[PDB]
Amino acid sequence: ANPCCSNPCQNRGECMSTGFDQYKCDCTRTGFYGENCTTPEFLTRIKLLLKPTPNTVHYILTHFKGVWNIVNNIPFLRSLIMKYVLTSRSYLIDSPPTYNVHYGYKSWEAFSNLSYYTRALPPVADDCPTPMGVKGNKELPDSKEVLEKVLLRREFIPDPQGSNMMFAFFAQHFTHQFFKTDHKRGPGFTRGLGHGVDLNHIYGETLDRQHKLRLFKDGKLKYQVIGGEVYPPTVKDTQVEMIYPPHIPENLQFAVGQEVFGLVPGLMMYATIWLREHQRVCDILKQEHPEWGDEQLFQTSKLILIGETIKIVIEDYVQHLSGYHFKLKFDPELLFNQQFQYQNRIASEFNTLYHWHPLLPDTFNIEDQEYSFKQFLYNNSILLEHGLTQFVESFTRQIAGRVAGGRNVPIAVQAVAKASIDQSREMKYQSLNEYRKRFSLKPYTSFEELTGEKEMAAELKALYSDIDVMELYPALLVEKPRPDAIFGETMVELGAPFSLKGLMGNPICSPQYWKPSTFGGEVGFKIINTASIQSLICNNVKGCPFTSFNVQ
Amino acid sequence: ANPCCSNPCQNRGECMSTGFDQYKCDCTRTGFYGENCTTPEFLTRIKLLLKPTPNTVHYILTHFKGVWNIVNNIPFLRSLIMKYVLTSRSYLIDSPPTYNVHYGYKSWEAFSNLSYYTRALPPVADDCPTPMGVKGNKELPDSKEVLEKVLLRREFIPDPQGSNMMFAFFAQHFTHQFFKTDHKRGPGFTRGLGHGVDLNHIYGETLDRQHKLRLFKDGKLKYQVIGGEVYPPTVKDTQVEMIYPPHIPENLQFAVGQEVFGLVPGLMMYATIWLREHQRVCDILKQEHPEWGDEQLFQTSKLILIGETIKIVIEDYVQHLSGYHFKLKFDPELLFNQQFQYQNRIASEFNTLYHWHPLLPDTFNIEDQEYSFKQFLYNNSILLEHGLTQFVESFTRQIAGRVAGGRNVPIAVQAVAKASIDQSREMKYQSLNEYRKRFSLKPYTSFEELTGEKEMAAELKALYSDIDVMELYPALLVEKPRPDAIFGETMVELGAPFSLKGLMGNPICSPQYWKPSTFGGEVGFKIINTASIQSLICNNVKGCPFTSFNVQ
Ligand code: HEM
Ligand code: HEM
Ligand SMILES: COc1ccc2c(c1)c(CC(=O)O)c(C)n2C(=O)c1ccc(Cl)cc1
Ligand SMILES: COc1ccc2c(c1)c(CC(=O)O)c(C)n2C(=O)c1ccc(Cl)cc1
Ligand SMILES: *[C@@H]1O[C@H](CO)[C@@H](O)[C@H](O)[C@H]1NC(C)=O
Ligand SMILES: *[C@@H]1O[C@H](CO)[C@@H](O)[C@H](O)[C@H]1NC(C)=O
Ligand SMILES: *[C@@H]1O[C@H](CO)[C@@H](O)[C@H](O)[C@H]1NC(C)=O
Ligand SMILES: *[C@@H]1O[C@H](CO)[C@@H](O)[C@H](O)[C@H]1NC(C)=O
Ligand SMILES: *[C@@H]1O[C@H](CO)[C@@H](O)[C@H](O)[C@H]1NC(C)=O
Ligand SMILES: *[C@@H]1O[C@H](CO)[C@@H](O)[C@H](O)[C@H]1NC(C)=O
């Protein structure tokens, strides 16, 4: 019934029901006019007839290596380039936020209720003929049918980019501070009220929690020593509530900070390296401040790790994921003369996009022993067995699956992949094409166009019939990867904005915050500006097991 | 012991204890260098040798009327001027926030714990020799002694600017949505987690609360009709918890939204006009949207009233408070090309500055009857007695006391004034001079300089001895008012920043939010863009009792 059901408003304008069967588009600031914010302003024509497509640019970024290496050495240029990646990308997200699970309109509730994941595209009116608004049949293809026909893995397809397990697990750990669906309330509700890189997953979600995990001596988090090794303290000791299967013998029920990092040793590995990292900084800050006390050592340490995290995620993680010859840079200054909202709200779409289960191999091979999912799950003795160094070496050397491409979802976490399909549906999502449109991308004219082949393509067609009506999540996985890459234009184009805004839209990046003293001195500031996944490991694992997010 | 106790860091740099007896100043971006961020950069000299003092500008603003009127009619110019007031003012506050009651340093806690009032200047180290850091005696003058010697009122001094009661109570109502000290935790802790103009004082602090105050029919708030008049529903009906003296006969225990607006009829008056206003919009929005339902009529209505509020507060309230011949303007676009943080955190200092008890007369004269504080307090029958129209007429014509100047605090709310003194002290505040410095103002060289006379001046001197050591709150009230004005340079200079940032740093002002459709159409948008205290009353009081924030 909703006259807007048909998503009639183009080029970003807003749709509004001006009467029962009437609608109106608010093309304000869109750069277009007319009934559907379709006809461009003359200066808009100009821009259109000048914008290199994603692939064009993606080409030029991943090519011309020699040229690039020159650029990477002309600071000014690199700075100007990175500066431009931050602004354009970021300019794609709404800050302050608008819309959510329940709000198809702006509303003060939608805006302030921090218990929701924000939504880049409003949901679909509960009174719309078809799930995707108006197009398509009275229901979308059975989830199980899509799960099996185009998602599930047969032959393990490895990542053509080299992503090893250090990366797969870093991305599991890292994003899990912001994606924490509150299943008590339903999908669309988050338990991470910080909405960003606050390291809640190391220090705890709340004050009461963090104080249970602290030592209160030199700003250090509590820990224990097994072997001559440092490990997270137990739930029995700190008394923090963690999620662990009852059969776990205690003494292995680690505390850490995120109540779920005990269900997967890849997480507890990183849970332990950062715990190690925190302390390491404490001692450093104490060496500089004999006069500082616990809480200041702590609060400052928690600020340095946030910087490392952001540092590492931009120049190692994201760098690698891009495969660009251009050296990405974490420099909060790039935006000091730019208009930029140092705030952020994690969106549902980002959560979906970040469902990278295909990275998972069929066995977790930790030097000499290979493990079934079932054997690895919440089995911390494995961590205690080989112990970090031999865990880091194993994982540095072990490709992860290709995300995009097709049929790569481990049958193990298949309950998950289906769940994703199901939930996106319950959270009234819009078509992959609308989302494509939302991110200045050109829509797919065919399943055949989407996949880059016809086996699955036609296979999906049989299911979704009309390409438009194709769903966002599935499409991401069953999509033509750009060359020897792990993702396709959609996945990069939709996530990069969400990813840089949440990375750069953090208080420590604000001018008031971005200064030596904010971190304990030029010494602490450097700990941030010279962070790396190699150092992260080098300084916290037994020998300096060389690592990277690339399986060589 | 804290080597920073002496507030050694000038021109905004940060102080840091680099060793027990040593400190270091982080002059980053201050525009100065050297041990204390004292020596300016050459380009800083320039700026210094070109900045008209507050009074200079204040003069030129309040003078040259003829010139000004020309300006006010050259949009472009006015827009450019207003644009300049927003940016410069706003540029004075830290966003994101830094420091609070407990945090003398940046910390993630200080930043994220929304239960605190942020702090423009860090507190004083609990291990500092003297309350004001190092200067002064082991203690500040007994509060009771300052209260009485220079604060308390003898002869009611009226406001030389004309502030009547509509203004005094509008300011009581208005700021009371953001200042809501959580006395359960202590001064420095707020109960207004929205930190701004969210109209929490009309709709309720929480969802559970707002839903109790709602009618759930056409987006309207619940109400009742006494006489042929609309009034807030009762606590017995809605079941919302309000603070009322037990002797109140129920039936007069109004609900409204802020749990304290029943203790003062001036508040309940405005509590009722906005309730009236909300509904009024609902009907308007239903007239445009036959298809809309409750929650949308509501959520949109609550968005229009926030706009009106911001509108009225800039062009009527603030306008008047300034006495500038230049017409202040509410135009969210002024900042669309500017760098601006559409966020905010209410600071303690703003709460203090906003302690305008001196506006209160000695009796509340509501046409034909005059009331003692004791008689007026939580006496709603008075409202039901004369009823709005004759309440608006009375209040439009009844001056309020002068804030600045000296000795104007009603002996009634004297417990309050002392309380302020006492609390600012417990919240480890800094000297009035430090604050003066903080806002680019030149410090007072003498109590004599402060007051603009010597009776009190010397009187204060006997108490504080060293001018620096003089406290912020007292000084605000016992300060030479600029000409025929209600405040003096300190009060304007410290609050205008806090005030414009919280007004302009609101989501509805952000580009995504500032558009016709955000409010239900070009009709709803106008309800905002043509708001006024006169219309607020005109459209919601029996006859259009003419009003203004000026007693003619
Ligand atoms: C041992 C490895 C892993 C296991 C067993 C695993 C398992 C799961 C499971 C059971 C869910 C819950 C789905 C539901 O109930 O609806 C989930 C969610 C998720 N997983 Fe994984 N996962 C693993 C690795 C990863 C990796 C490497 C990534 C990379 C980004 C990832 C990203 C996600 C995301 C973003 C969610 C949603 C989080 C939320 O909204 O709560 N997972 N995973
Ligand atoms: C009938 C008139 C008024 C009465 C009886 C009154 C009474 C009070 C009282 C009892 C307090 C609490 C102090 C404490 O316990 O520490 C207070 C706080 C305050 N009042 Fe008023 N007041 C009135 C009018 C005003 C006006 C017109 C203003 C104008 C701005 C004002 C501004 C404030 C502020 C900003 C606070 C602090 C609020 C907070 O932090 O919770 N008051 N007032
Ligand atoms: C292959 O090329 C890539 C891949 C990923 C990228 C980027 C470029 C860029 C930068 C750029 O594209 O210019 C950013 C910011 N990426 C992300 O961090 C990211 C993270 C998660 C998701 Cl789901 C999507 C994107
Ligand atoms: C006499 O001249 C004034 C007085 C008050 C003013 C302003 C100008 C301006 C604008 C300007 O000065 O340009 C703003 C924004 N004012 C406030 O609303 C305000 C409110 C409360 C406090 Cl505590 C302090 C200031
Ligand atoms: C807008 O779209 C509708 C159908 O979606 C169509 O009838 C109408 O002509 C279009 N108008 C413009 C200006 O695009
Ligand atoms: C957020 O919204 C949902 C539904 O409106 C509500 O149940 C929940 O309590 C709200 N959360 C907060 C913190 O207000
Ligand atoms: C904020 O701080 C106070 C005192 O430190 C604490 O009691 C309260 O729980 C904190 N709130 C949050 C949300 O952490
Ligand atoms: C956990 O892994 C260890 C080492 O590979 C193994 O001995 C143990 O059987 C596993 N635990 C379970 C419950 O299978
Ligand atoms: C800074 O202040 C200290 C004492 O507070 C003094 O010794 C030093 O000379 C000052 N320097 C400047 C440039 O103000
Ligand atoms: C409150 O006002 C009413 C009506 O004017 C009056 O009857 C009553 O005496 C007042 N209450 C007190 C305690 O004075």
Pure H helices in B367-520? 373-376, 381-386, 389-396, 414-426, 432-438, 447-451, 455-464, 472-477, 489-504
Residue positions counted in chain A: 552
What 8-state DSSP symbol labels residue B231?
E
Check CB contact under 8 Å for B515 and A339: no
Q: Burial level of A390, CB count in 10 A (0-12/13-18/19+)?
A: middle
Q: Could you check whether A1-41 and A42-552 share the same CATH topology?
A: no
Q: How far apart are CA A125 and CA A146, in angstroms?
A: 24
Ligand 4 pocket member B476 (CB < 6 A): no
Cβ atoms of A202 and A274 within 8 Å: the answer is: yes
Cβ atoms of B200 and B194 within 8 Å: the answer is: yes
Which residues is chain B interrupted after (C–N above 2.5 Å)?
none
Give the class (CATH, top level) of B1-41. Answer: mainly beta
Cβ atoms of B320 and B167 within 8 Å: the answer is: yes
Q: A36 CA distance to ligand 5 centroid (A)?
A: 6
Q: How far apart are CA A291 and CA B4, in angstroms?
A: 12
Q: How far apart are CA B96 and CA B342, in angstroms?
A: 10
B270 is catalytic: no
Residues 6+ apart with CB under 8 A from A276: A230, A540
Cβ atoms of A501 and A173 within 8 Å: the answer is: no
Q: How far apart are CA A236 and CA A255, in angstroms?
A: 9
What is the residue-wise DSSP string for B90-115?
A: HTTS-SS---BSS-SS--HHHHH-TT
Task: Please count the other Cβ atoms lying within 10 Å of the Cβ belonging to residue A211.
Answer: 13
Pure H helices in A4-48? 42-48
Nearest Cα residue to B434 out of B128, B87, B230, B155: B128
Q: How far apart are CA A256 and CA A297, in angstroms?
A: 19
Residues 6+ apart with CB under 8 A from A437: A10, A443
Residues 6+ apart with CB under 8 A from B358: B153, B401, B402, B403, B408, B409, B410, B477
Contacts of residue B29 in chain A, CB cutoff 8 Å?
Answer: 511, 515
What 8-state DSSP symbol labels residue A315?
I
* C-alpha distances out from residue B40 to A83, A519, B45, Å: 29, 25, 6
Nearest Cα residue to A499 out of A355, A344, A356, A358: A344
Q: How far apart are CA B344 and CA B499, in angstroms?
A: 10
Check CB contact under 8 Å for B17 and A103: no
* C-alpha distances out from residue A340 to A5, A92, A332, Å: 33, 12, 11
Q: How far apart are CA A455 and CA B196, in angstroms?
A: 56
| Nearest-by-Cβ selection for B341 from A16, A110, A341 | A341
Q: Burial level of A339, CB count in 10 A (0-12/13-18/19+)?
A: middle
Structure-determination technique: X-ray
CATH T-level topology, domain A42-552: Myeloperoxidase, subunit C (1.10.640)
Q: Where are the domains of chain B?
A: 1-41, 42-552
Check CB contact under 8 Å for B108 and A303: yes
Residues 6+ apart with CB under 8 A from A273: A388, A536, A537, A540, A541
Ligand 3 pocket member A32 (CB < 6 A): no
Which residues are registered as beta bridge partners of B118?
B100, B347
Residues 6+ apart with CB under 8 A from B132: B124, B140, B430, B431, B468, B469
Instruction: Check if B438 contacts A (Cβ < 8 Å).
Output: no
Q: A523 CA distance to ligand 9 centroid (A)?
A: 24
By three-state DSSP, how is residue A450 classified?
helix
* C-alpha distances out from residue B377 to A207, B373, B416, Å: 40, 6, 15
What 8-state DSSP symbol labels residue B369?
E
What residue's CA is closest to ligand 10, atom 5? B382
Q: How far apart are CA B86 and CA B91, in angstroms?
A: 8
Instruction: Check if B127 contacts A (Cβ < 8 Å).
Output: no
Q: How far apart are CA B304 and CA B519, in angstroms?
A: 6
Place of tokens 């009060």: B491
What is the residue-wise DSSP string for A408-442?
A: -B-STTHHHHHHHHHHHHHTT--BHHHHHHHTTPP
Ligand 3 pocket member A93 (CB < 6 A): no
Check CB contact under 8 Å for B292 and A17: yes
Pure H helices in B452-532? 455-464, 472-477, 489-504, 522-529
Element (H, E) at B366: strand B364-366
Residues 6+ apart with CB under 8 A from B239: B212
Direct distance between the N- and C-terminal alpha carbons of chain A, in angstroms, rounded to an integer: 56
By three-state DSSP, how is residue A218 classified?
coil
Task: Please count the other Cβ atoms lying within 10 Å of the Cβ belonging to residue A58.
Answer: 20
The token pair that represents B92 in the structure block: 């004075």
Q: Which one of the listed residues B117, B223, B270, B354 is annotated catalytic?
A: B354
What 8-state DSSP symbol labels residue A443?
P
Contacts of residue A303 in chain B, CB cutoff 8 Å?
Answer: 106-108
By three-state DSSP, how is residue B518 classified?
helix
The alpha carbon of residue A206 is apart from the nearest alpha carbon of chain B, in Å, by: 10
Which residues are registered as beta bridge partners of B370?
B365
Ligand of minimum distance to the alpha carbon of A364 = 1
Cα of A349 vs its chain's centroid, Å: 10
Contacts of residue B24 in chain A, CB cutoff 8 Å?
Answer: 517, 521
Pure H helices in A369-521? 373-376, 381-386, 389-396, 414-426, 432-438, 447-451, 455-464, 472-477, 489-504
User: Which is it for the CA torsion A163, A165, A170, A173, positive or negative?
Assistant: positive
